[PDB]
Design a protein around this ligand. Structure first.
Ligand SMILES: [Mg+2]
Ligand SMILES: [Mg+2]
Ligand SMILES: [Mg+2]
Ligand SMILES: [Mg+2]
Ligand SMILES: [Mg+2]
Ligand SMILES: [Mg+2]
Ligand SMILES: [Mg+2]
Ligand SMILES: [Mg+2]
Ligand SMILES: [Mg+2]
Ligand SMILES: [Mg+2]
Ligand SMILES: [Mg+2]
Ligand SMILES: [Mg+2]
Ligand SMILES: [Mg+2]
Ligand SMILES: [Mg+2]
Ligand SMILES: [Mg+2]
Ligand SMILES: [Mg+2]
Ligand SMILES: [Mg+2]
Ligand SMILES: [Mg+2]
Lengths: 141, 55, 124, 185
RNA sequence: CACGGGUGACGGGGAAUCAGGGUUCGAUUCCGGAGAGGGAGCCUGAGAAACGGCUACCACAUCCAAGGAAGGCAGCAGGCGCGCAAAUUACCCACUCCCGACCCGGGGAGGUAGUGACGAAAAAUAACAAUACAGGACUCUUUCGAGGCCCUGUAAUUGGAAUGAGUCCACUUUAAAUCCUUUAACGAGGAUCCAUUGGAGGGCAAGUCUGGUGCCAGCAGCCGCGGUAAUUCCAGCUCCAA
């Protein structure tokens, strides 16, 4: 601190209270602009209906097509490109399926090669995409 | 284009998994691990090798 | 080979009973049944077995010792007077009816519908 | 409102660095030397020993001849003397800080059964405890982490219902006699 | 720092993390408050502006012969909906207590079971012995080698010994049960009675092993890897962490 007087506790507490708002991690939590902008809304997962399967070109040096999925959520109606992680797991996903969609692990940030995808697909029609990949469960038909 | 989904995982050579004597588990696994760490090998000269170091 | 000792003895004059912590030792067999407990309390305190009420056994781990509770009344006109009815129904001297609790509530709400003497005629 | 406790406490703490090569070099000696089952058994003895040292530092900051520091200090020494980790002449609360994890793993019943010589190996002793072969003062103990007090160390022996003690043979030898008597007739 | 506004604001005892300070949470079993779809008004009563009490209006909604009548699960179970997100339309007043004219009656309060990997505690999935073998402090030997008072380890080599998990009578438990504990009878050698989950370039413990792919498929929290010899993808073996 700078003002060290013995009865300056309102000068100090109201200066941390002012200057906490210049912290980027603090203001995002304590303004409602970022919770409104979050397509989940302070949730960790969201079911959503697939409406098309989208190929996303990767960024710089990496040259690949990232196999993503245009998801429209149930709870909001908001539209989202979510990612499909493992190899060949886009073929399990048919159109018009309720898929469970998580984050990517970076708390609202684009991750790695993919430009502007914040979300990945966990389950495909109440069957996990891991068990579809491994072969433990089968797509229910 | 999304035509190449499942390319490499589809075209790999399908290798059947080898059968194997099952590993002991629990303190017995940890015991066999302790023996292959400490009580067997001796200090020798030069740079020492790894647990899976093959060449 | 079954030895039974008593701990924490007390005479209840205001309940007309004895009371003790039964300590059964059976190293070599199962938890010995309560019929065999009452007959051995009978020869220990020189009393009849019908005034003896014994309950609450939990056998230790390892199993060479248990711990139970017991009361010994003066007569059956005390042992039926101050005693829980479920422990009088164990030996055979008390009988509850076979109407269950949901049939009793369902009739009480039907008897609440009907006014007068016809409350006796609601059920059956 | 239900009438039940919900008072529960974790008895271990996982360490701050997950993949130190030197901590795994250290803690895996403790499992081999003392026949333990996992790292959580190592991690829970370090956490009890941290609690005793944490209460030890809290008493050393108190002034000498404090009415709390004498009573809490005498109790904490007695609780370490009776288990047999602290020496009965060394009972002074400044020596609790000079105390390490291998001293608790000695007073474990699995290592006492090994050091009393009624066990073949450290890993044989834990098979004896799990199969209800040994007792401590007419009480069959089934659990190897039993902290044997100094008072009750000289009473460890085989349980009375055990073929390793004076009892019936096991399932196996009863069947080996039955096929032997089945073979002869 | 009034007044106004927002609160993903019921307050507190408390909880999580923590050197010392602190930061965040506290709908949630204890204390206080508020409310019974939304507001409003009353009657009886010591005590209610009561909703498992009435009276209206609004919303929702059931029976009808169309004149009327009936309602309030944010009690306990349960159902629909909403969702990322949460249990049986079970048994009993035996325990704790409550109420009543009362030792007797009643209590979805409460107790006990069923679902339960929210979470916490304890804790099996082998141990031993003998054969080959690989080694070590002795003694001998220049080394080569060797004897065993003594070890330590490995191997679908062999051997009987100990046990639960389970099967199943019986007690005990209990209101009646179920479970734990006690206990006969069965129950183990590839002890098939089979432990997974993630990873192996660096951070970060652990292979420049082999096959396929050829900036593709894909991996990658970050740096980065893949452009026909990939320590980084897809597989097998092996190893590593819990
Ligand atoms: Mg870059
Ligand atoms: Mg508000
Ligand atoms: Mg609120
Ligand atoms: Mg609260
Ligand atoms: Mg009210
Ligand atoms: Mg409602
Ligand atoms: Mg009202
Ligand atoms: Mg109601
Ligand atoms: Mg009420
Ligand atoms: Mg849950
Ligand atoms: Mg009751
Ligand atoms: Mg009554
Ligand atoms: Mg209840
Ligand atoms: Mg197993
Ligand atoms: Mg690999
Ligand atoms: Mg790494
Ligand atoms: Mg490394
Ligand atoms: Mg990697």
């Amino acid at each position: 601190g700078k003002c060290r007087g013995l009865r300056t506790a309102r000068k100090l507490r109201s200066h941390r209270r002012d200057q906490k708002w210049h912290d980027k991690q603090y203001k995002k939590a304590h303004l409602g602009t970022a919770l409104k902008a979050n397509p989940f809304g302070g949730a960790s997962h969201a079911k959503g209906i697939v409406l098309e399967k989208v190929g996303v070109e990767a960024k710089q040096p990496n040259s690949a097509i990232r196999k993503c999925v245009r998801v429209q959520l149930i709870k909001n109606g908001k539209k989202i490109t979510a990612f499909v992680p493992n190899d060949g797991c886009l073929n399990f996903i048919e159109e018009n399926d309720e898929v469970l969609v998580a984050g990517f692990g970076r708390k609202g940030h684009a991750v790695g090669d993919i430009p502007g995808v914040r979300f990945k697909v966990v389950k495909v029609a109440n069957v996990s995409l891991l068990a579809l990949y491994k072969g433990k469960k089968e797509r229910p038909r | 284009s999304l035509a190449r989904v499942g390319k490499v995982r589809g075209q790999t050579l399908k290798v059947a998994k080898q059968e194997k004597k099952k590993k002991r588990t629990g303190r017995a696994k940890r015991r066999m691990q302790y023996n292959r760490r400490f009580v067997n090998v001796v200090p020798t000269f030069g740079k020492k090798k790894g647990p899976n170091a093959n060449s | 080979t079954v030895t039974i000792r008593t701990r924490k003895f007390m005479t209840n004059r205001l309940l007309q009973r004895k009371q003790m912590v039964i300590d059964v030792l059976h190293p070599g067999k199962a938890t010995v049944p309560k019929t065999e407990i009452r007959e051995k309390l009978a020869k220990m305190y020189k009393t009849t077995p019908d005034v003896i009420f014994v309950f609450g056994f939990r056998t230790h781990f390892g199993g060479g010792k248990t711990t139970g509770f017991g009361m010994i009344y003066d007569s059956l006109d005390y042992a039926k007077k101050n005693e829980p009815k479920h422990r009088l129904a164990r030996h055979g001297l008390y009988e509850k009816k076979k109407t269950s609790r949901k049939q009793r509530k369902e009739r009480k709400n039907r008897m609440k519908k009907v006014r007068g003497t016809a409350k006796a005629n609601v059920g059956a | 409102p239900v009438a039940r406790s919900w008072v529960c406490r974790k008895t271990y703490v996982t360490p701050r660095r997950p993949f130190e090569k030197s901590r795994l070099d250290q803690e895996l000696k403790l499992i081999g030397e003392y026949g333990l089952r996992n790292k959580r058994e190592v991690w829970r003895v370090k956490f009890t020993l941290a609690k005793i040292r944490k209460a030890a530092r809290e008493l050393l900051t108190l002034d000498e001849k404090d009415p709390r520091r004498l009573f809490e200090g005498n109790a904490l020494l007695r609780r370490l003397v009776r288990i047999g980790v602290l020496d009965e002449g060394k009972m002074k609360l400044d020596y609790i800080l000079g105390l390490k994890i291998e001293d608790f793993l000695e007073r474990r019943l699995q290592t006492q059964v090994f050091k009393l010589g009624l066990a073949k190996s450290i890993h044989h002793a834990r098979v004896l405890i799990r199969q209800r072969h040994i007792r401590v003062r007419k009480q069959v103990v089934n659990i190897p982490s039993f902290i044997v007090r100094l008072d009750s160390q000289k009473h460890i022996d085989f349980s009375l219902r055990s073929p390793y003690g004076g009892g019936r043979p096991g399932r196996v030898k009863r069947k080996n006699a039955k096929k032997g008597q089945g073979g002869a007739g």
